[PDB]
Short mmCIF file of C-alpha atoms in Angstrom, two decimals:
data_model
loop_
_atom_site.label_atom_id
_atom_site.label_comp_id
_atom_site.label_asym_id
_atom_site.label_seq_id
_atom_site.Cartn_x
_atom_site.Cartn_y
_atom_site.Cartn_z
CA UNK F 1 -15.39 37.93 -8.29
CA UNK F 2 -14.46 34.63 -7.22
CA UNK F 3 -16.72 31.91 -8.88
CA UNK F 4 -16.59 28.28 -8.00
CA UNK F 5 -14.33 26.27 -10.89
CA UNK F 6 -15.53 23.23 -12.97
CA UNK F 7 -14.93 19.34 -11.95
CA UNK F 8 -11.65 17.47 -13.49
CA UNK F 9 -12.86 15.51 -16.86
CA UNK F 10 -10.60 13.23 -19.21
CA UNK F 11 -10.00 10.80 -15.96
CA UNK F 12 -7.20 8.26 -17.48
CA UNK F 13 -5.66 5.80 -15.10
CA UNK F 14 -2.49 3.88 -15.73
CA UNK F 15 0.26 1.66 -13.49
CA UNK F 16 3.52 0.47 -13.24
CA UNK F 17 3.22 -3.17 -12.93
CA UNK F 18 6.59 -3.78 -10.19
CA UNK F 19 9.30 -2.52 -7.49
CA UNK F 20 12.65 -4.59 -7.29
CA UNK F 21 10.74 -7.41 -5.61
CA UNK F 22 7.71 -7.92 -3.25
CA UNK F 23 5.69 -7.00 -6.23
CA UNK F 24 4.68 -3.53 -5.26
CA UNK F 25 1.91 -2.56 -7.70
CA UNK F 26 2.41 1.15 -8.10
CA UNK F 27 -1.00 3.06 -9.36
CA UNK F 28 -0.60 6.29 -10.77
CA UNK F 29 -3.69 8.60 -11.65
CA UNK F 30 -3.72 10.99 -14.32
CA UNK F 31 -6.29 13.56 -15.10
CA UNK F 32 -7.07 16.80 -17.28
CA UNK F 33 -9.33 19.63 -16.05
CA UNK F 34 -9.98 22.73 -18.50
CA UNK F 35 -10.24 26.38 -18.18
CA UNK F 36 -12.98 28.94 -19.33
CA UNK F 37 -15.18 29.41 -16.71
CA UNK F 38 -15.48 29.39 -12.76
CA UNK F 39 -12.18 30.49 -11.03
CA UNK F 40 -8.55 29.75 -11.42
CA UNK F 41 -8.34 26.27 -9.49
CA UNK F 42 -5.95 25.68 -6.88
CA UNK F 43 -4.75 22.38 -6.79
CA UNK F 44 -6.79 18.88 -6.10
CA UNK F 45 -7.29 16.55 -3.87
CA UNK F 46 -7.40 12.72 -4.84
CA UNK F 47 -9.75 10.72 -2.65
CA UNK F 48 -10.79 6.90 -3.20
CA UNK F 49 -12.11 3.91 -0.85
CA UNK F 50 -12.07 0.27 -1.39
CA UNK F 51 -14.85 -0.70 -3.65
CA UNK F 52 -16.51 -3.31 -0.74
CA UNK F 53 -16.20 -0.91 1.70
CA UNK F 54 -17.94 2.09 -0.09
CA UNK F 55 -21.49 -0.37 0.17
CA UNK F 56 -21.22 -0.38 3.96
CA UNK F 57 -20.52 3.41 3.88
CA UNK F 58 -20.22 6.28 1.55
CA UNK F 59 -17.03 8.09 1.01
CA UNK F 60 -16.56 8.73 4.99
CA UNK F 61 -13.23 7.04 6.07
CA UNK F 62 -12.04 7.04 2.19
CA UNK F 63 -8.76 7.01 1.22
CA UNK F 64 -7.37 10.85 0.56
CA UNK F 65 -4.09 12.66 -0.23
CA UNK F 66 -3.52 15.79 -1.47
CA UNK F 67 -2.83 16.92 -5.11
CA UNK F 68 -0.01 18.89 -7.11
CA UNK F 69 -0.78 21.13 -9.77
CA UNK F 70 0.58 18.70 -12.15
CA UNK F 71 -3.27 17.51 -12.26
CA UNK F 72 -1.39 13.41 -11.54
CA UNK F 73 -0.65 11.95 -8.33
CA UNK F 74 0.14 8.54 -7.65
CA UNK F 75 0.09 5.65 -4.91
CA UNK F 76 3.20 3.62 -4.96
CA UNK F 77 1.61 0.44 -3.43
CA UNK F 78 -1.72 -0.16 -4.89
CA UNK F 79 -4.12 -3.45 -3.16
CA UNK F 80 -4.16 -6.03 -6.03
CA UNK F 81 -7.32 -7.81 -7.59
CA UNK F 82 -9.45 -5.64 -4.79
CA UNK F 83 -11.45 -2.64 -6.60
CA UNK F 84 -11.57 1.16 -6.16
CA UNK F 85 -13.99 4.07 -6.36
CA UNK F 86 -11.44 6.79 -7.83
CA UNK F 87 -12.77 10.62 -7.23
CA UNK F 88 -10.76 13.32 -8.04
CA UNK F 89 -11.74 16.89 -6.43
CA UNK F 90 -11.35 20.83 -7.63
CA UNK F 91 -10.99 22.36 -4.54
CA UNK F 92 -10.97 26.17 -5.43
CA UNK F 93 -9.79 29.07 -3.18
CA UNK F 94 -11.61 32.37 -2.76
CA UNK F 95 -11.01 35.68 -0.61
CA UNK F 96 -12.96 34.59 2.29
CA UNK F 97 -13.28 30.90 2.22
CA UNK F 98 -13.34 28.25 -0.47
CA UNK F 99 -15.58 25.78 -2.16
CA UNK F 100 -14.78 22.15 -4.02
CA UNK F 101 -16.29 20.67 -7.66
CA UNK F 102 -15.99 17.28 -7.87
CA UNK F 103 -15.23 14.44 -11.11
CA UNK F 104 -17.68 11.70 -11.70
CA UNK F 105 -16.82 8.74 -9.56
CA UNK F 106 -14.84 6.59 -11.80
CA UNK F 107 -13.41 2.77 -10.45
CA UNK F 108 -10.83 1.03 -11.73
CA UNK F 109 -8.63 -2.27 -11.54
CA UNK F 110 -5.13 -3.05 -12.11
CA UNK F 111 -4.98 -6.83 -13.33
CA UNK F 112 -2.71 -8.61 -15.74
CA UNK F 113 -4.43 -6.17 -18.62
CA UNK F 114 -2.06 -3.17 -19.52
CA UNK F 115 0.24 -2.02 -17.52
CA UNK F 116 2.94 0.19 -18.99
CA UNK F 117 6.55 1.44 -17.88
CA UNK F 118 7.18 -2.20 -16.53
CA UNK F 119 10.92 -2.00 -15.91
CA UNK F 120 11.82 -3.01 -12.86
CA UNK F 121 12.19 -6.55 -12.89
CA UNK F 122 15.59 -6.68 -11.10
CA UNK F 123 16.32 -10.32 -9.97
CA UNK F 124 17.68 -10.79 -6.44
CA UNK F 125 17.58 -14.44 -5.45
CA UNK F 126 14.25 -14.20 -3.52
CA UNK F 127 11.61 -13.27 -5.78
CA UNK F 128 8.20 -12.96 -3.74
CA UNK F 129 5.19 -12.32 -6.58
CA UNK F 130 1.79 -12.20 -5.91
CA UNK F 131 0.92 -15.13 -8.13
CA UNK F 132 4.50 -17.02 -6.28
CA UNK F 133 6.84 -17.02 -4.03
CA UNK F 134 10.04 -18.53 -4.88
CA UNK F 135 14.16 -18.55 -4.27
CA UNK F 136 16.51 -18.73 -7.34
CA UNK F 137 20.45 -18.50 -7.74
CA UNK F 138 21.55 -16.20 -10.51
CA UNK F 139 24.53 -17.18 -12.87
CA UNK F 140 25.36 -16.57 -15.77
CA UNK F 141 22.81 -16.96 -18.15
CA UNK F 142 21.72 -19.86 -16.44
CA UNK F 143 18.86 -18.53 -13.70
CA UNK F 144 19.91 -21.59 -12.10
CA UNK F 145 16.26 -21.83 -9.60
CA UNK F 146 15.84 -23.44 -6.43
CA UNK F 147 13.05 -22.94 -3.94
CA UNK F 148 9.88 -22.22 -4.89
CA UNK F 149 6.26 -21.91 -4.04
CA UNK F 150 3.51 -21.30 -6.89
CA UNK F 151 -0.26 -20.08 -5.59
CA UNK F 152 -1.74 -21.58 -9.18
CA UNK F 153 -0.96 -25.57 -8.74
CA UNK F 154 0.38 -25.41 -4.57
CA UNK F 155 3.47 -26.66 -6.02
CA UNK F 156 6.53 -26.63 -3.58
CA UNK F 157 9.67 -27.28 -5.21
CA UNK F 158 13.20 -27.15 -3.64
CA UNK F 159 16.87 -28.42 -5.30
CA UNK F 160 18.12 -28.20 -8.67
CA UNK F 161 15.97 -29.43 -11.43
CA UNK F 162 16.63 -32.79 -13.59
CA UNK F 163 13.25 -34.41 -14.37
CA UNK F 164 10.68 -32.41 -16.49
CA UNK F 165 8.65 -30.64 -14.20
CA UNK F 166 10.31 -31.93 -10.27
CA UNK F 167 13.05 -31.82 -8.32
CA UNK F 168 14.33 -34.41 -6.03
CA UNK F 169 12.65 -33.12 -3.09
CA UNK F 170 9.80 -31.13 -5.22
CA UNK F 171 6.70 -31.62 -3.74
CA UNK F 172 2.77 -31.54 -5.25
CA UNK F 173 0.41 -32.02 -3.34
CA UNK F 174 -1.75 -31.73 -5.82
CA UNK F 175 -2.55 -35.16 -6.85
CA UNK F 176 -0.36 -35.24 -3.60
CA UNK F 177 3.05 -37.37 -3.05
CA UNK F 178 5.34 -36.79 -1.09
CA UNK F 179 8.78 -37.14 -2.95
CA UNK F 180 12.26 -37.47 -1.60
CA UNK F 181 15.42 -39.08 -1.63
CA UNK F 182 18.39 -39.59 0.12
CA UNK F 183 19.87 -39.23 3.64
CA UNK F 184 23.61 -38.39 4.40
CA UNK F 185 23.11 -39.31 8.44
CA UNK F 186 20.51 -41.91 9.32
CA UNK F 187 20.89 -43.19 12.65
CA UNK F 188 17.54 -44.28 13.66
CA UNK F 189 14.01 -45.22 12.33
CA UNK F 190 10.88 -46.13 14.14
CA UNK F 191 8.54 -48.25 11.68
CA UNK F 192 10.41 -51.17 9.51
CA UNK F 193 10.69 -49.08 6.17
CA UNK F 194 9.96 -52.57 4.53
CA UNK F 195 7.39 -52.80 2.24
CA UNK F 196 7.12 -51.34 -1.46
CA UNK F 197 3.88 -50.02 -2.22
CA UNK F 198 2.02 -47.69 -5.09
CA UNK F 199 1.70 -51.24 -7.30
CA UNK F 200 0.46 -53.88 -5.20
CA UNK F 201 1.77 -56.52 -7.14
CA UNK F 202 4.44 -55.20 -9.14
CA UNK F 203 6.23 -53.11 -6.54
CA UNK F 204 6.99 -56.12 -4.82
CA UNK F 205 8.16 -56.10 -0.49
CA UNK F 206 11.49 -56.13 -0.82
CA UNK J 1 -4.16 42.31 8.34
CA UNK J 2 -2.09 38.97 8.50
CA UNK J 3 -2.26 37.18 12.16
CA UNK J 4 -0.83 33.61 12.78
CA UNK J 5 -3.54 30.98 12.98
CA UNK J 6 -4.16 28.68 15.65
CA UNK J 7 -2.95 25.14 15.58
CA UNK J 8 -4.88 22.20 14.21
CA UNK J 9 -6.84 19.75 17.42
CA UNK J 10 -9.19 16.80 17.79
CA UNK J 11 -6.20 14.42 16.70
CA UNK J 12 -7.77 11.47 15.86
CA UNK J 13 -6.26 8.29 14.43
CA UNK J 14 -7.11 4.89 12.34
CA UNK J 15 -6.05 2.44 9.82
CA UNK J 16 -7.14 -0.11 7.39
CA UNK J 17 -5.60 -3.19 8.51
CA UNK J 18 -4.06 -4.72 5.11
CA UNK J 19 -3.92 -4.61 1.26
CA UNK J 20 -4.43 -7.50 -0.71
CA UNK J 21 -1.67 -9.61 0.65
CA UNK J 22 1.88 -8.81 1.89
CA UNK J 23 -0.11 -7.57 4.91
CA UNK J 24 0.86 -3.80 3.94
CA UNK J 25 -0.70 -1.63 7.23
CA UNK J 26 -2.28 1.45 5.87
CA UNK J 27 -2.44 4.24 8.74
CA UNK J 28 -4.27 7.40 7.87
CA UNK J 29 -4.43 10.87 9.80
CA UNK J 30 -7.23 12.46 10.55
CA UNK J 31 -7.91 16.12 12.80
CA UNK J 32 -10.38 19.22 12.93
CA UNK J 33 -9.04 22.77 12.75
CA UNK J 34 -11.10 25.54 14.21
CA UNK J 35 -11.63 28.63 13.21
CA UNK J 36 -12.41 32.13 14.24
CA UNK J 37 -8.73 34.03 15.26
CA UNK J 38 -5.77 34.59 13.35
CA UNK J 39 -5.57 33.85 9.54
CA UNK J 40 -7.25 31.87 7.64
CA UNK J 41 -4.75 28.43 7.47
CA UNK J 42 -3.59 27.45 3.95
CA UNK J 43 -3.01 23.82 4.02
CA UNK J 44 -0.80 21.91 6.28
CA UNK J 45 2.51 19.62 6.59
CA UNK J 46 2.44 16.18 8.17
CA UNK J 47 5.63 15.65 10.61
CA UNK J 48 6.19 12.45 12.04
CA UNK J 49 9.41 10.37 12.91
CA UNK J 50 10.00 6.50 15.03
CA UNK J 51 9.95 7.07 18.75
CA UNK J 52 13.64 5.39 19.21
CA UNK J 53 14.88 8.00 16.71
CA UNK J 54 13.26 11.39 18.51
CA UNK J 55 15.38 10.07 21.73
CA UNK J 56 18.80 10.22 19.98
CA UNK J 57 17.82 13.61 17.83
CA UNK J 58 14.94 15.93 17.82
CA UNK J 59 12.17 16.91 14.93
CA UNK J 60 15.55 16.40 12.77
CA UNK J 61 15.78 13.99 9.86
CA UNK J 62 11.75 12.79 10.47
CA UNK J 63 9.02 11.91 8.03
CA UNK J 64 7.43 14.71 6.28
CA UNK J 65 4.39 14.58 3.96
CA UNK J 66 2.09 17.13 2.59
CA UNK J 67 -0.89 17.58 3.25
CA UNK J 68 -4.21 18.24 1.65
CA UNK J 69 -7.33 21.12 2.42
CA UNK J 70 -9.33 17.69 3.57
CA UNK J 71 -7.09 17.85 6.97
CA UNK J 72 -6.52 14.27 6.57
CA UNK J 73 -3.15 12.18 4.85
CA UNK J 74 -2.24 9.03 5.03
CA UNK J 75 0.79 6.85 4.84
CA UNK J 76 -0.08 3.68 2.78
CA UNK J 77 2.21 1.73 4.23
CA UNK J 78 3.29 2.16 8.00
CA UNK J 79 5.76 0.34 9.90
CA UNK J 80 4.07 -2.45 12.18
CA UNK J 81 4.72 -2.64 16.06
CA UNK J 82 7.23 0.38 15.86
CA UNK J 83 5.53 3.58 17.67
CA UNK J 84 5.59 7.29 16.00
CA UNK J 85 5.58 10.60 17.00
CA UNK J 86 3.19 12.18 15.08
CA UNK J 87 3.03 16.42 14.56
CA UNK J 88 0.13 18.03 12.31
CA UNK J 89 1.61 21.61 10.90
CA UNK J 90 -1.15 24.44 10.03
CA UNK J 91 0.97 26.46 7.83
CA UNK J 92 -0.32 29.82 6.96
CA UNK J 93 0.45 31.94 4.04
CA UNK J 94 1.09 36.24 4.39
CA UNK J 95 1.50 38.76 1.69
CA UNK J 96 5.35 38.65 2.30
CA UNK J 97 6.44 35.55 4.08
CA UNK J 98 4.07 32.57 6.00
CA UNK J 99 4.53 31.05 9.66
CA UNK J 100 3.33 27.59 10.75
CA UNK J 101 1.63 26.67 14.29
CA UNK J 102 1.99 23.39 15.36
CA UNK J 103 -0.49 20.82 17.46
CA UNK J 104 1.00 19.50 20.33
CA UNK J 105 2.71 15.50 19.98
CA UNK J 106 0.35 12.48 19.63
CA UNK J 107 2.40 9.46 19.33
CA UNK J 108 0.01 6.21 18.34
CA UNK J 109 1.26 2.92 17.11
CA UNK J 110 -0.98 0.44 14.82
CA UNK J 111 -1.15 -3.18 16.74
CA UNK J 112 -4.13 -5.67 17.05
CA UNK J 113 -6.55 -3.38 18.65
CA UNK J 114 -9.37 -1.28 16.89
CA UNK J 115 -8.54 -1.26 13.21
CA UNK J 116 -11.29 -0.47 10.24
CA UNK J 117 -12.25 -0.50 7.33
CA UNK J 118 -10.64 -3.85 6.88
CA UNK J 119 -11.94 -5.49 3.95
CA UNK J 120 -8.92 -5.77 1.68
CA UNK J 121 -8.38 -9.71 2.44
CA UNK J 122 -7.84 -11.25 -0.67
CA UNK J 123 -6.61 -14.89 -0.72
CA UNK J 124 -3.91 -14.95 -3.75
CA UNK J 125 -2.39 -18.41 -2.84
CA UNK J 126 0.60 -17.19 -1.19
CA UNK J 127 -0.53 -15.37 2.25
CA UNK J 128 2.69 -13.24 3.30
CA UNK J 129 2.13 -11.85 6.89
CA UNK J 130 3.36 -10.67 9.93
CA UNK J 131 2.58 -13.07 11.87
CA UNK J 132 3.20 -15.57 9.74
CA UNK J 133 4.30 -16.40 5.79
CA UNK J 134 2.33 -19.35 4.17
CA UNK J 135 1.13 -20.95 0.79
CA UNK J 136 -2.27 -22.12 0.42
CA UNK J 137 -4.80 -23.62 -2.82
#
């Protein structure tokens, strides 16, 4: 009497944005399959493949992992900004041998748009992010902040902040300059270190 | 009528070189099981553990995953340049109690030769890898 079961439906996807640090994007999938016809289903088996490799080939050499029966299973360190083809499979069981149903394909992509159960932002002095890496001193409630490196303006900032938006030895090289200051041990030079220059008349040689 | 099945063959491994950045190695399993004595296998356990660490104890304290019907898991993100003994369980299932038949050891080890599926490099600005940690615009 074994009968083959029906494919998952109600495919909802969801994330939780962090780890600690590193910015480890954890994807969980989530999914509700019915009962009233077919055979009892035994467990699942989530398979997916990355969304520009699936147009090269089709679902051979996809990413797979096996299933509880809590119909969710998750991957703890999802690729970020790069897509997915999401299928989730029925694999039934019968006497002799078995046979699988399968979802609709259904891709998704986690982003900066709703991600839920968020709380792991635990500060630790290096704080490498996807969108920067950077190296800050905790006190108080001061996040006093040091190094830094942003991938939005290629900022590089190092020291204490006084001015605005720099350091003493902050860098941009957007709109570049190259911005220091000060020199406990200066024994040597090689060109004269002379002129003033950036105002040709009213940064006078001196 | 329950018989032990045979053990799983045709180990065969491969990875996808990196995620979108943080170069995180993805190495998946893959093998063929056979059929036609003993029982018919119900699914299967994936044993593995670091080469330096079977030396000093044995199949004790190593990685364990489950494993799907598809006869093919995958660790997301695998240690790079550090080999692995890798073990592929077919555990059976009886009427009173089960008992597993093991493949014999593949070890395998991820390096700069003969990855695939590849296509998961995504400049983000700040390009952490393992050969080298830079920020670009």
């Amino acid at each position: 009497n074994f009968v083959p079961p029906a494919a998952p439906i109600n495919i909802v996807f969801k994330a939780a944005r962090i780890a600690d640090g590193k910015e480890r994007y954890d994807l969980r999938v989530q999914w509700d399959w019915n009962r009233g016809a077919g055979a009892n289903v035994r467990e699942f088996v989530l398979s997916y493949i990355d969304s520009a490799e699936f147009v090269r080939t089709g679902w051979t050499k996809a990413q797979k992992i096996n299933v509880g029966a809590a119909q969710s299973a998750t991957i703890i360190s999802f690729p970020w900004k790069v897509e997915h083809k999401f299928k989730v499979s029925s694999i039934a069981w019968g006497p002799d041998a078995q046979d699988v149903t399968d979802s609709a394909v259904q891709t998704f992509i986690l982003n900066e748009s709703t991600p839920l159960d968020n709380s792991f932002v635990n500060e630790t002095g290096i704080e490498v992010n996807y969108a920067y890496i950077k190296g800050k001193i905790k006190d108080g409630s001061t996040w006093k902040q040091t190094f830094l490196i942003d991938a939005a303006t290629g900022a590089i900032n190092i020291g204490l902040l006084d001015a605005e938006g720099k350091a003493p030895i902050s860098f941009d090289p957007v709109k570049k300059i190259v911005n220091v200051d000060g020199s406990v041990i200066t024994k040597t030079i090689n060109a004269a270190n002379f002129v003033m220059t950036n105002l040709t008349g009213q940064d006078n040689p001196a």
